[PDB]
Amino acid sequence: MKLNVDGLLVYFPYDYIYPEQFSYMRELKRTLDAKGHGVLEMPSGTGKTVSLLALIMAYQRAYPLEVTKLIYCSRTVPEIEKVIEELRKLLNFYEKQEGEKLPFLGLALSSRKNLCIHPEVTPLRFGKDVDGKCHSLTASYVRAQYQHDTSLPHCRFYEEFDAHGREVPLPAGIYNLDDLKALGRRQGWCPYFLARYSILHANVVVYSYHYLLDPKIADLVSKELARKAVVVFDEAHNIDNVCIDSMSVNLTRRTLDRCQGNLETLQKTVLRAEHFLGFLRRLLEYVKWRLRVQHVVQESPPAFLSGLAQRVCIQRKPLRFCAERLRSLLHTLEITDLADFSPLTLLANFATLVSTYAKGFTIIIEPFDDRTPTIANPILHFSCMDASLAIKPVFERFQSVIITSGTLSPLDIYPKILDFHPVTMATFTMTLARVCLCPMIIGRGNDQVAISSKFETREDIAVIRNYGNLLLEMSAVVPDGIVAFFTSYQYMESTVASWYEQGILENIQRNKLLFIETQDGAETSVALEKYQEACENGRGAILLSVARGKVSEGIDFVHHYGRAVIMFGVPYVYTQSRILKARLEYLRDQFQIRENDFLTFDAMRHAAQCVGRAIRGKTDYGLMVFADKRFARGDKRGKLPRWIQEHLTDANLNLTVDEGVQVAKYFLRQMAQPFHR
Amino acid sequence: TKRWEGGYERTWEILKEDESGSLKATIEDILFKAKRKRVFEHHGQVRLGMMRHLYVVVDGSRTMEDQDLKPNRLTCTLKLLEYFVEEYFDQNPISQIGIIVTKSKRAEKLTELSGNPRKHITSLKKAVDMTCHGEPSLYNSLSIAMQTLKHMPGHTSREVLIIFSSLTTCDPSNIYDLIKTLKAAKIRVSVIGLSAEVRVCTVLARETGGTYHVILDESHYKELLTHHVSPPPASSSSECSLIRMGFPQHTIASLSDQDAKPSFSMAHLDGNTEPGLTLGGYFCPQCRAKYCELPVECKICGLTLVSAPHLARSYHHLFPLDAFQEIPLEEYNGERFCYGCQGELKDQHVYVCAVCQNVFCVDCDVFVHDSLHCCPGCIH
DNA sequence: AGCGCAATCAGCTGTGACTACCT
């Protein structure tokens, strides 16, 4: 229906609008009228996207001049496809409610592997070689030699798109990635090239974070698209981590071995301009000098260039030219493929980063390995320390950057973690006919001994027995699915080993099946599949995993999957490896951020992010427990999102295992009754 | 706007006076209006039914030892099951009840599918002192129920009731295939949970057409069982659904006559103690076998022995009595004596039957429509 | 051994009835 905002009417596919959605629309309209950025926090993954798109379309219709381009950067490809299909549903609703079409174009962007039609590159699973093969098949030299019609195998989609697809536009009709591929294959055009041509003449477009956070591709994909545009980062609770990883590179023995292997081939090709031919040869030994040095750590972000200009005595000026040399010398050398060549490009990227970015970074060398620390492994990584650098080139190029996710409880730390000027300070807590979640914090066990996962008490037998008892008698009350997140893989395996040693793991087995998530991707996928198939029937299952793992955020536990989420201790990141402590010191001496406050913020952010995936949809319900007394302290509860705070009553903040089980039983019994709409 | 934010209601404005004392007439009207508070139907719901072959599955796992329902789940479940069996046999004359107990990943057929209530109640009382161990197996119980009910006639409604206390079930094979087979066999499955909602039970109930519910307390448990007592609606006419059953007259033997022949009861012959060798009882009309309890299907010739009054008690639903035409006393130019109670007609309204055009007062009309279910005049 | 949340004491007040002193 038509929702009447204070100064506009907006069509919405769903007749009924929840108060949270209405308040969200009010706040977003206020921000758009304020011409400023903002941060938002909503508890529903679904229903936020439709409201966002509806308000965006209404604002564009009312003010075509104020807003011209929309960006909906998300985390992965499933989010892209679901937002595209939701936009398609919205457009279908608008067509069926209005009767006339509109000249609005919406496309989804992804990598070369996602959008390609050649059968010679699809079967392979090399993401770093598909771009190189695509460049080799079609490039400037390919276009130049196509005039003579050279008899050689090459891609021909571009050779038809440049002569037929650069004239006919697509004013109307939003196209999904599969639709783009179908159009490209029926018209003999490359989907990527037609997307590149049609982004200029487009209304909305969605892609991943890496196309804006990484400077090496943001300029190519967004240079003069729109001076005044709206960008939104949905599910951006970990925006700082990806921003840090944007300017983070790693070096090891394999990388330098590959570089020394391929430099001989490069020299052989060259001997068949001179400013870099001799420049590239002696760069390897400077970094291999650290390989032979048996030292713990060396830190010198400003003095790294000074040290480089002593052993080899090279000026700082030529370092910045690597970026412009990459696009020039390589295309003249006619590289056959990017295989066995990416480390050379990453070395140039590292050199450019250290030459240009040296104010808020640090160089760390880590000669440590898991289970084999000191054999041969000096690991050099240019770890980023400030999250503002990856977010600067978007705040100054846009007007209403919005950070929204399901876990953004502290709105006073994000504006200081990254340079930001919020004007919203807005949070929304969902309301339903009944409370769909039962958050509670379990402290001491039945023996009145705290189950805190403190480092000095990790090896304690009493706390391990209490954790096992909690998981056992909890598994008898919540049916068809329990998700348990541990602090780390080492703690998880040490706890399950102790459970196996005692006669307690058998009692858990006879209630629900035990599934352990490991680092292997195929093993994790098959374990998830069998966990789902066990949850489908009445057998029940337990999913044991780690809070900081690829399975914590890779999947969503929709209703009847994972009715209970258990947090075994506060998930604290490893303070070792001398990487976290550098960031802690940088935030201490730069943003005046307390180290304890930042650690608690990260721990609670991860805990809330991994515990809020059990509530997807109004009808969905789930049980949330926190098996640590440290959660009971106010400084950690206050970091939980507002949609969980009001449901966490003061009655259950330190209750034992038995009373937690009783509360879970009452909640589950009272949540099985029919409800209304 | 709001209903209560407008004008305050004045309910006392109904009464009025014209001759200073008509309040007696008003209260007489109020007293007359107080009567006729029913719709002239004791049930007003389903007026018919169908032969139900219901199987009741009871969980026998360790979860039945939980003290959610005092004293434990098993005792309350069995007491409410005895009540349910009694009420179900009261409201279903030719129905049958089977009881299955699942324990240690296996299902035991506690009682055969039959219409004797006493046998089921005795079996439940015996099972009160069972041992709760292991885990339930929905697959085995459903397989046993399907195997028993596959050969039953199509016209009978085949139903399974599952009392699932434990939240975990062990299936030796895939259960969704069994659910598809049950759906193809048109077997209705209903589940009453005790702890919380289980996905497999919801899927089973939705696919087989049954209902899945979760107990809040003992009163809610009894309400759910009482709802399950009611028969389902029956189609107009499917096929030649009939059944050969006898009506054994309760012929007792008196020694005053020379035909006083004592006989042992077949039902009592299976008891450990001395069977009741009473003078008489219910003799089978086909093979002259002697039985004491009814309705019990004959063991020898297979004839179903039912009691005619039990079948006849539901005949008033087939032929309900049409409501009498309400007529004011002044407009009725006839006799002023009620045909049922011979009392003088002094009420403002007189009810006249549409068939015989007789005179009935308010009380007699209510009695005829509610209890008698027949017009006394139409009988003559 | 510096912060910060939480346990703890002081001061005032409500509710109810019991009790000492004197016009």
Added chain:
DNA sequence: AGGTAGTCACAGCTGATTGCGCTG
């Protein structure tokens, strides 16, 4: 010989002190 303000018991609140815990 009669009646009202202290007074005790038991509870509440808010306003500070002040004392134990605080990261793999």
